[PDB]
Amino acid sequence: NIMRLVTPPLNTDPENLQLGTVTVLPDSDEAVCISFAITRLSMEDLQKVKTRVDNLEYNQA
Amino acid sequence: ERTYDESGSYKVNGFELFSEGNAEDDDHVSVVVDAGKAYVKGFKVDKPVSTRISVPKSYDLGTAENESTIFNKSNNSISLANSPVKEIRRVTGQVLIEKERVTRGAQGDGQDFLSNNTAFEI
Amino acid sequence: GTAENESTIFNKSNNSISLANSPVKEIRRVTGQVLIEKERVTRGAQGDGQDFLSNNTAFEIVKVWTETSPGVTTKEYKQGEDFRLTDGQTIDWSPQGQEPSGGTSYYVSYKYNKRMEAGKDYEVTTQGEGLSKKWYINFTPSNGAKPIDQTVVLVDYTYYLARKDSVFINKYGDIAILPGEP
Amino acid sequence: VNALDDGAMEGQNPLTLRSVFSEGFISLDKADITHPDFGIVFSFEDAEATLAYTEAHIWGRLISAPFTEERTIYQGQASETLNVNPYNIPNPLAQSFQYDENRTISSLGLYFASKGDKQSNVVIQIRGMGDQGYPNKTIYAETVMNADDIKVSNNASAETRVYFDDPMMAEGGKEYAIVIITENSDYTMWVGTRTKPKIDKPNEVISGNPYLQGVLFSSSNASTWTPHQNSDLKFGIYTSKFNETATIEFEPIKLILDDMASSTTFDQLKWEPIGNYQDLDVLGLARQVKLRATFESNRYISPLMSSSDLTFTTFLTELTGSYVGRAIDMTEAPYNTVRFSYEAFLPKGTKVVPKYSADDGKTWKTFTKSPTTTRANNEFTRYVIDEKVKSSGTNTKLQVRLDLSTENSFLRPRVRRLMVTTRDE
Amino acid sequence: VNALDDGAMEGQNPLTLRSVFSEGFISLDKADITHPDFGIVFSFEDAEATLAYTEA
Amino acid sequence: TFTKSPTTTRANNEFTRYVIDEKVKSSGTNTKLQVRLDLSTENSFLRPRVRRLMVTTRDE
């Protein structure tokens, strides 16, 4: 599709983990690579998220 | 089974994408996937070194037809909307012929053919 | 044989237009200038941006305006300082002048070349028989899009070709035929 | 909820909250008023939205009125005439008031000393009062009064009655200001001024202030107001109290034996002739059936429809309209789940259909789930929908819509406190 | 974004949003006008800031 | 000064949105914040403009 409307293919296979998408420009050697891999969240990260939520509700108050 | 039922598939680290453009083939673009670790379907997938992959170049064509623009005598140039143009199939515009010599046919009240068969006004 | 860009001026008084070549097989394309009146368009979020029209073959903007009730023009935007036609596809608001607020809807009127559809915009009929038979494009349906009056309609179609062959006999008594050029 | 109370939005490239959209029905900034389907009217005093009457045969008399009016405020003393536009006569006015409780204003009373020609008209408005005791630009009601409707007298005896299509809910302890506007320079009104003789009783003079809690105002552009502390308009304000039911009767009436079966098949509680329809009829193939319609009354009944003389087509008009919000760009916050919440008051024979679009109004979708209902008050009920609109993938655009419709003119729906939020799950 | 439209800030011991700071360019409360390097001017109607002309 | 280059999104014909997201501190956490924008020109007519400044912090 044209660059304004191009989208990556839609997939729902559980057996595969998506690491990212590669976009190729029309008739060119250049290509745009982006990583969208799902990454874990350790307990420290979740605690930091909880602290962020606490700050959010404090600011709301 | 326990890992997938608890957390599903996820990445741990690595697996960054980088473009290199190695000239293994003119019809492909090389891409490098950096080393990393991940758990897919509950099974660990540890890769110590980067993996090279190649994508085919895009050559599929879109057709634009009846792209209209009003011609101005002051400015002769007219632009095309789609940028990566390959080839122009046809350009058509109204043209005026002045003083075209025509021979009268032998038959009376007959028909004399013009040099161009796309005429619409005398 | 292929006939392309066969031109005929369309008249509002007489919708029918004839095809020069008699044995027509199929009509590849019928195109004519059509006017769209009161096409709803939504303003994009980006200021001084571009809003895409439903048809990408537009070549002239007639009127751009907004309405709160039917027939009441709240405002009419002036072409050349408020907006301009870009690439025959978009209403570009890059000129300095006024523009609608982001997320608001406004009307657009414009002209474009529509590829007419058989059985929807026109119907094909015939009168005669044999070599005198003729094919016509009638533009009969009421809801179908008709060409603007006193504009050119281009038709692309194919038609069969005749062939003339010569009969020969050799000294062995073998009758044979050489095919001529169609 | 916090965004519900903002009521402000920029024109060119507005910053919008991601995954949030709410309408407090307090301003026009959030609404796409230029949309072709936009036909709703706001009531800023109540922060509600409703449908205004639109006209697009036999007469009918409103026997059991839907409410009873009572004159609570009345300043009767008058002494002088003041031109409605004093500062532009070759060679607008307002009067403030307030109530100590929550009252449903139904109609106004005004007294005009002179009027213009047949074609002239006067615009009557109710505007709010700001903190420093002056009229503001907010308008809670508006109507147009023709010259015929404006009665005049040389002794301040003629009282022209002003009705609005929507009742004005005056909140207790808040000031409000009647406003009178007209471009014509030949309109005058009676004003009572302290220390001046009365028109009908010169022997007596207005000793104290005519209306203590109000002030007369004058302006050259309906923005800057000059107060007249010692003067007040001669006016009266009527407040209403709605009753249980209302009844209309039509004047007596394609062959009667087919006609009465055909008619009583359509005149029923569920078709657009809403309410308990009844008739009586006369034998001998007489033509004079007489119709009656009874319906349940409420506090939102239009005083203009009650006061006006009905017909079988003005009544039984099916009003329609919709609210359409400005398109929201959710590119930086893709979503696939939507939580739609709104409070709606639904009299019998009314509907509110929520809708959404993820393509800038090109296509409008509908929710498959049925809303869960929680009661807000006696009238309004809260409707909430929580549905995964997209099974796979994520949308990047949002545009909220509500479709309102009615079966008859008197009974209309009302909506308020519209909150829409989106999520990615 | 919501804090961008506030445009108010107390003088002595102000309550401030944690991990948030935004300037709507509609008031001087958020700005440290007494800083040595402060040399911008406000355009409150446009909610913009720029530089004014100065000699030498 | 931030080491990353800002990602650009166009706002209108004049203004462009600049966004930076950088882990300013590799280890530990800061406890103070003071925002600053430095504006400069090289003639008297052509001057820059700024609006809608928003700065937020996180612990990651």
CSV table of N, CA and C in Angstrom, one decimal, chain C residues 40 42 103, chain D residues 9 16-22 30 324-331 333-340 355-361 363-364 367 389 395-401 419-423:
chain,number,residue,atom,x,y,z
C,40,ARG,N,-20.0,16.4,2.6
C,40,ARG,CA,-19.6,16.6,4.0
C,40,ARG,C,-18.1,16.2,4.2
C,42,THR,N,-14.8,16.4,7.1
C,42,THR,CA,-14.4,16.6,8.5
C,42,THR,C,-13.0,17.3,8.5
C,103,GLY,N,-11.7,19.2,14.1
C,103,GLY,CA,-12.8,18.3,14.5
C,103,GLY,C,-14.1,18.8,14.0
D,9,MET,N,-12.3,24.4,24.8
D,9,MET,CA,-11.6,23.6,23.8
D,9,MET,C,-11.1,24.6,22.7
D,16,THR,N,-6.0,17.6,23.5
D,16,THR,CA,-7.1,16.8,24.0
D,16,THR,C,-6.6,15.7,24.9
D,17,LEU,N,-7.3,15.4,25.9
D,17,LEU,CA,-7.0,14.3,26.8
D,17,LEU,C,-7.0,13.0,26.1
D,18,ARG,N,-6.0,12.2,26.3
D,18,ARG,CA,-6.0,10.9,25.5
D,18,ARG,C,-6.9,9.9,26.2
D,19,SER,N,-7.7,9.2,25.4
D,19,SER,CA,-8.7,8.2,25.9
D,19,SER,C,-9.8,8.7,26.7
D,20,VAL,N,-10.1,10.0,26.7
D,20,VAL,CA,-11.1,10.7,27.5
D,20,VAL,C,-11.9,11.6,26.7
D,21,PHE,N,-13.2,11.6,26.8
D,21,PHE,CA,-14.1,12.6,26.2
D,21,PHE,C,-15.3,12.8,27.1
D,22,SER,N,-15.6,14.0,27.5
D,22,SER,CA,-16.8,14.3,28.3
D,22,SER,C,-17.4,15.6,27.9
D,30,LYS,N,-17.1,22.0,22.8
D,30,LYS,CA,-17.0,20.6,22.6
D,30,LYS,C,-17.9,20.1,21.5
D,324,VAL,N,-23.7,15.7,18.4
D,324,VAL,CA,-22.5,15.2,17.7
D,324,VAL,C,-21.3,16.0,18.3
D,325,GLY,N,-20.3,15.3,18.9
D,325,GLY,CA,-19.1,16.0,19.4
D,325,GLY,C,-18.0,16.1,18.4
D,326,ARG,N,-17.1,17.0,18.6
D,326,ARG,CA,-15.9,17.1,17.7
D,326,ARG,C,-15.1,15.9,17.7
D,327,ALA,N,-14.6,15.6,16.5
D,327,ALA,CA,-13.8,14.4,16.3
D,327,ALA,C,-12.5,14.5,17.1
D,328,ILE,N,-12.1,13.4,17.8
D,328,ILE,CA,-11.0,13.3,18.7
D,328,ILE,C,-10.0,12.4,18.1
D,329,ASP,N,-8.7,12.9,18.0
D,329,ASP,CA,-7.6,12.2,17.4
D,329,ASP,C,-6.9,11.3,18.5
D,330,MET,N,-7.1,10.0,18.5
D,330,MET,CA,-6.5,9.1,19.4
D,330,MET,C,-5.3,8.3,18.8
D,331,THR,N,-4.6,9.0,17.9
D,331,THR,CA,-3.4,8.4,17.3
D,331,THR,C,-2.4,7.9,18.4
D,333,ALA,N,-2.9,7.3,21.5
D,333,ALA,CA,-3.5,6.4,22.4
D,333,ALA,C,-4.5,5.5,21.7
D,334,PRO,N,-4.0,4.6,21.0
D,334,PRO,CA,-4.9,3.6,20.4
D,334,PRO,C,-5.7,2.8,21.5
D,335,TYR,N,-6.9,2.4,21.1
D,335,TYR,CA,-7.9,1.7,22.0
D,335,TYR,C,-8.7,0.7,21.2
D,336,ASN,N,-9.2,-0.3,22.0
D,336,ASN,CA,-10.1,-1.3,21.4
D,336,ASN,C,-11.4,-1.5,22.3
D,337,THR,N,-11.5,-0.8,23.5
D,337,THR,CA,-12.6,-1.0,24.4
D,337,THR,C,-13.1,0.4,24.7
D,338,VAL,N,-14.4,0.6,24.8
D,338,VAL,CA,-15.0,1.9,25.1
D,338,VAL,C,-16.0,1.7,26.2
D,339,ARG,N,-16.0,2.7,27.2
D,339,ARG,CA,-17.0,2.8,28.2
D,339,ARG,C,-17.8,4.0,28.0
D,340,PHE,N,-19.1,3.8,27.6
D,340,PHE,CA,-20.0,4.8,27.3
D,340,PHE,C,-21.0,5.0,28.5
D,355,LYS,N,-24.1,6.2,19.9
D,355,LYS,CA,-23.4,5.8,18.7
D,355,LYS,C,-22.0,6.3,18.8
D,356,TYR,N,-21.1,5.7,18.0
D,356,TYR,CA,-19.7,6.1,18.0
D,356,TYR,C,-19.1,5.8,16.6
D,357,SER,N,-18.1,6.5,16.2
D,357,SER,CA,-17.4,6.4,14.9
D,357,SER,C,-15.9,6.4,15.1
D,358,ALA,N,-15.2,5.5,14.5
D,358,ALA,CA,-13.8,5.5,14.5
D,358,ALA,C,-13.2,5.9,13.1
D,359,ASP,N,-13.9,6.6,12.3
D,359,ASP,CA,-13.5,7.0,11.0
D,359,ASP,C,-14.0,8.4,10.6
D,360,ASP,N,-14.1,9.3,11.6
D,360,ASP,CA,-14.5,10.7,11.4
D,360,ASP,C,-15.9,10.8,10.9
D,361,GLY,N,-16.8,10.0,11.3
D,361,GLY,CA,-18.2,10.1,11.0
D,361,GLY,C,-18.6,9.5,9.7
D,363,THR,N,-18.8,6.3,9.0
D,363,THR,CA,-19.7,5.2,9.4
D,363,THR,C,-20.0,5.3,10.9
D,364,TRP,N,-21.2,5.1,11.3
D,364,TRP,CA,-21.6,5.1,12.7
D,364,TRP,C,-22.0,3.7,13.2
D,367,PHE,N,-23.7,-0.2,19.8
D,367,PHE,CA,-23.3,-1.1,20.8
D,367,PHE,C,-24.2,-2.3,20.9
D,389,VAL,N,-15.3,-2.9,21.7
D,389,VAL,CA,-15.8,-2.6,20.4
D,389,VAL,C,-15.1,-3.3,19.3
D,395,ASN,N,-8.4,0.9,17.4
D,395,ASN,CA,-8.8,2.1,16.7
D,395,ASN,C,-7.9,3.3,17.1
D,396,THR,N,-7.9,4.3,16.3
D,396,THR,CA,-7.2,5.5,16.5
D,396,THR,C,-8.0,6.8,16.4
D,397,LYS,N,-9.3,6.7,16.3
D,397,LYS,CA,-10.2,7.9,16.2
D,397,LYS,C,-11.4,7.6,17.0
D,398,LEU,N,-12.0,8.7,17.5
D,398,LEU,CA,-13.2,8.6,18.3
D,398,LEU,C,-14.1,9.8,18.0
D,399,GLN,N,-15.4,9.6,17.9
D,399,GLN,CA,-16.4,10.7,17.8
D,399,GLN,C,-17.7,10.2,18.4
D,400,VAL,N,-18.2,10.8,19.4
D,400,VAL,CA,-19.3,10.4,20.2
D,400,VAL,C,-20.6,11.0,19.5
D,401,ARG,N,-21.7,10.3,19.6
D,401,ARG,CA,-23.0,10.8,19.1
D,401,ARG,C,-24.1,10.3,19.9
D,419,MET,N,-20.1,11.2,29.7
D,419,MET,CA,-18.7,10.8,29.9
D,419,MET,C,-18.4,9.6,29.1
D,420,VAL,N,-17.4,9.6,28.3
D,420,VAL,CA,-16.9,8.5,27.4
D,420,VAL,C,-15.4,8.4,27.7
D,421,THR,N,-15.0,7.1,28.0
D,421,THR,CA,-13.7,6.8,28.2
D,421,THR,C,-13.3,5.5,27.4
D,422,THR,N,-12.1,5.4,27.0
D,422,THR,CA,-11.6,4.3,26.2
D,422,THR,C,-10.4,3.6,26.9
D,423,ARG,N,-10.2,2.3,26.6
D,423,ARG,CA,-9.1,1.6,27.1
D,423,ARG,C,-8.5,0.7,26.1
